[PDB]
Amino acid sequence: VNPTVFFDIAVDGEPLGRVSFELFADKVPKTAENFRALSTGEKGFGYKGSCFHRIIPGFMCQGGDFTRHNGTGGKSIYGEKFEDENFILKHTGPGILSMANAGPNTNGSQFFICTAKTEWLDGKHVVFGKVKEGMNIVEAMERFGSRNGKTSKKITIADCGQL
Numbered sequence: 001v002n003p004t005v006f007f008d009i010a011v012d013g014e015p016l017g018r019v020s021f022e023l024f025a026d027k028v029p030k031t032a033e034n035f036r037a038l039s040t041g042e043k044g045f046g047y048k049g050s051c052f053h054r055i056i057p058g059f060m061c062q063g064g065d066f067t068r069h070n071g072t073g074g075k076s077i078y079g080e081k082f083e084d085e086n087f088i089l090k091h092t093g094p095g096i097l098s099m100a101n102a103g104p105n106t107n108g109s110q111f112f113i114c115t116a117k118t119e120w121l122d123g124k125h126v127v128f129g130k131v132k133e134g135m136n137i138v139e140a141m142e143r144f145g146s147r148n149g150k151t152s153k154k155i156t157i158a159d160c161g162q163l
């Protein structure tokens with residue numbers, strides 16, 4: 001009953017693979033719903049076509065800016081920002097899916113995928129899902145990042161939706 005969404009990742013237009021996520025709707029229903037709906041395009045805007053603007057090998061992959069495409073933008077389905085729903089779930093390891101923000105209660109659409117345990121982010125970012133399949137694709141994505149996060153190739157979500 002927890003929903004599943006997929007990203008089809010491309011590298012400079014070339015298909016790399018699919019990453020799928022379980023969204024923890026049972027534990028963070030509002031945050032899960034935001035990410036779910038942005039993945040299908042059913043609100044008239046969303047993740048499709050946007051890039052991962054910041055990738056830091058060993059740390060995380062961040063994307064979700066489909067409004068400005070420069071890492072400063074994005075929006076939720078609820079208006080511009082919504083609340084940190086809760087901090088029940090932790091950044092326990094690679095594959096953890098978590099909301100980026102700009103301070104308390106500023107969730108929009110930007111998100112990140114952990115490539116390691118990042119317990120120092122616990123209580124600071126709302127965890128709301130986990131890579132289900134395709135962790136090997138996220139690892140492949142890492143190779144195009146850098147210690148400062150800038151990417152050496154355009155890493156995009158060529159398609160996305162609900163499974």
Ligand SMILES: CO[C@@H]1[C@@H](C)[C@@H](OC)/C=C/C=C/CCOC(=O)[C@@H]2CCCN(N2)C(=O)[C@H](Cc2cccc(O)c2)NC(=O)[C@H](C(C)C)NC(=O)[C@@H]1C
Pocket residue numbers: 054060062071072073099100101102110112121124125149
């Ligand atoms: C360009 O972004 C601006 C600045 C954050 C940016 O300046 C170059 C600073 C980057 C610092 C990078 C060090 C690596 O850490 C990250 O990348 C983190 C990891 C968790 C998710 N995340 N980004 C975030 O949630 C970060 C803030 C952050 C940074 C470090 C740790 C942390 O817990 C949160 N927000 C953002 O990326 C938001 C957008 C969601 C609008 N951006 C803003 O508020 C600003 C406009």
